[PDB]
Amino acid sequence: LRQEAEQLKNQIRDARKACADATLSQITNNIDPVGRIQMRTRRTLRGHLAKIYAMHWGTDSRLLVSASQDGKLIIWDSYTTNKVHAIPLRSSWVMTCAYAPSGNYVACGGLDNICSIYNLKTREGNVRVSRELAGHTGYLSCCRFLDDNQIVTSSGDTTCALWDIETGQQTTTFTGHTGDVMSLSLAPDTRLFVSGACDASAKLWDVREGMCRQTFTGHESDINAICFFPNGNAFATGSDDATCRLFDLRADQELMTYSHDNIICGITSVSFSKSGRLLLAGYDDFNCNVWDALKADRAGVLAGHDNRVSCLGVTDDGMAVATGSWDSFLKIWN
Amino acid sequence: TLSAEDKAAVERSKMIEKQLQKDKQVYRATHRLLLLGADNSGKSTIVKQMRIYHVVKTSGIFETKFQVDKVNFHMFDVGAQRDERRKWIQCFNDVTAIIFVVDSSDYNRLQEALNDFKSIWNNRWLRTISVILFLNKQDLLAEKVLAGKSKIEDYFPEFARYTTPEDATPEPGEDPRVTRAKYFIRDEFLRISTASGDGRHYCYPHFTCSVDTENARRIFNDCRDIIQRMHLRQYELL
């Protein structure tokens, strides 16, 4: 019966080959590059005792949550560098933080296997654990809010799950990966999401149904970060094989690879700009790179970190990009 | 310059900074450890005994606090993870040490233990992280060598030509064969450690029984050495 699977895989490969006529490079060749982009440090957010893994902006584009392995979530006022909140976590080994679109909640997860959801707006003045989501048999690598009541978690166990925050049960359990899922990016419309795992593969999922709608395989190693192009029909990845890749949901292929011979470290965070003309990637070579998505040339370098960039985030209106490194600092670049 | 409200906001930030400084003081004084070992490896006994004499169904990491000579130690053993390691091991690149507990009485799973040790030692993120390897279950190894039913040269052919090193220290007085066997195991692990050290981190062998009460002191002494080496590097002494 395995021969049937091999034949079907060959058929899918042939269909993808047939649907390919031109590459993004040829078609974009008649469009001018962004040129040299100089982005400067505007604010440095100090205060984390250990290294920073995760950082998620608020939809108000001013507030900002960050996670450190010292066991602390800090909410920042990016305009004034103030500390709005400091949430002591129950497990120090956090590797993901999320900020609710409404701004009422923040979530975190890590080696504890729980996604903890925090209530930022209470009658009392403190922030408290709204509830703890349990059920994963592996570390939670990413968590994203759909609304105040639904959250999507990705785990070291191949499962990505969908939870109802009211009474916390895995409403839909997404399975099909073979390795540890690392990144998780919701579509702008919150009906699909992409997962990048250690099987060097990415999958688009349908949240309402629970089925792997598409499966992308183009990488030579494990996949570390993922993000949607603002349009909702393309996404970009980062892998430890020192490359980024841009896949199109409708074309079901790879469009352009962002690589250079000099760089040999892995990408740890990928974030697009507001228009997608700039693709920002965080690396292990102490520095962050800014790429032109249409011409695949290094447009800029964001180099001010003394350790590896572990998180990277671009605000909803595109004014600033935040990057946090293993040196316990966030930098707000404009 | 800035309104009543911003001033108050700034005050809040300053109070938060004060609590964080306190957290920094507590964090710096506490040394973190990662406990690694197999299923047959007796790390469960070591963690239980250290919890006893010193100081939730799919939970992934277990926190074990203990204190030796007024020094605080946090020891973590991963509970609910899969076989794969190459991702969550990156989180432990700032620990004081990695305690690697091995079952020395297996003789058949011990090549797998060597492979795991060579995976830990050569990890790109675990460079500059020393390893306190606990060669656990010495009594079982002693009784197994004395009984003579199961051999050791059969699984490791080089055991025949191996001779007992002159720096051996079998203290209580034990048969020469058990000393030879345990130092052969130790020498295999130390060969892996020495092959590609480059001097940025060390491996500290210890022969352990899971019931022994001296394991905390062993960890304390090794951690003292590790911190001494780091501070030597930091204060421009080498």
Partner: single-chain antibody, 232 residues
Framework: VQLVESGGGLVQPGGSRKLSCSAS????????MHWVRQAPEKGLEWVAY????????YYADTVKGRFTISRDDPKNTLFLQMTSLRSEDTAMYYC??????????????WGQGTTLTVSASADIVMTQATSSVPVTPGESVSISCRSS???????????LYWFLQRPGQSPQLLIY???NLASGVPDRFSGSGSGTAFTLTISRLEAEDVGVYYC?????????FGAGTKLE
């Protein structure tokens, strides 16, 4: 959350008293606290404010030296050391809770009040419109306020606050920073203005919407209030 305050009574002129405000149901240590008094038939006046961490203590000019404010965060009680009680010190003193960060809602909870009866310059003035607006239920009203100095700041925040006071219990917050409806306020209430002239609108009144409407500025100390507007 609740703020219960006590320690008041008939006091002879020139005497002293220590007003205490017991707080429970919220994280006291992270809140700043205000003392607001109102004369027996007049509007509200600010007495003092103590910050979280006690690093900022402000007093009104009228009580600049006689009064002293303190807090006991462990024991969770707010104190007011009053000395040399003159005859303008006959009022009901209110305990108010204020927290300050981006997006915060100051002056949200007001304590019940202590009654204290005594036997026989460059400050911002806030002026209400006629202190009587008789309106039938189901209509819409547009209570107005005027400020001497433009409450808008370079931040982009205009610091106008709207409070409602039933004929009975302590005031409750309705609008903070000029356009934001407090936790629990119905969507009928809406606030607007242009920096100096302000308006609060209630879209469709009810029988429970009656009381006296006070404004407040938080642009700079001291906190001045205004006379208040009565609805009947």
């Amino acid at each position: 959350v609740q703020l219960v305050e006590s320690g008041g009574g008939l006091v002879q002129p020139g005497g002293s008293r220590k007003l205490s405000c017991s707080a429970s149901g919220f994280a006291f240590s992270s809140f700043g606290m205000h003392w607001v008094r109102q004369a027996p038939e007049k509007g509200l006046e600010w007495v003092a404010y103590i910050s979280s961490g006690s690093g900022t203590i402000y007093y009104a000019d009228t009580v600049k030296g006689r009064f002293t404010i303190s807090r006991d965060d462990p024991k969770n009680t707010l104190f007011l050391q009053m000395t040399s009680l003159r005859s303008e010190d006959t009022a009901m003193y209110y305990c108010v809770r204020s927290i300050y960060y981006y997006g915060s809602s100051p002056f949200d909870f007001w304590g019940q009040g202590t009654t204290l009866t005594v036997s026989a310059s460059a400050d911002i003035v806030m002026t209400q419109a006629t202190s009587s607006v008789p309106v039938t239920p189901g209509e819409s009203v547009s209570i107005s306020c005027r400020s001497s100095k433009s409450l808008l700041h370079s931040n982009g925040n205009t610091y106008l606050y709207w409070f409602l006071q039933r004929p009975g219990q302590s005031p409750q917050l309705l609008i903070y920073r000029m356009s934001n409806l407090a936790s629990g306020v119905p969507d009928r209430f809406s606030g607007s203005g242009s920096g100096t002239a302000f308006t609060l609108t209630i879209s469709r009144l009810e029988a429970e919407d009656v009381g006296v409407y006070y404004c407040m500025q938080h642009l700079e100390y001291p906190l001045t209030f205004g006379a208040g507007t009565k609805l009947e």
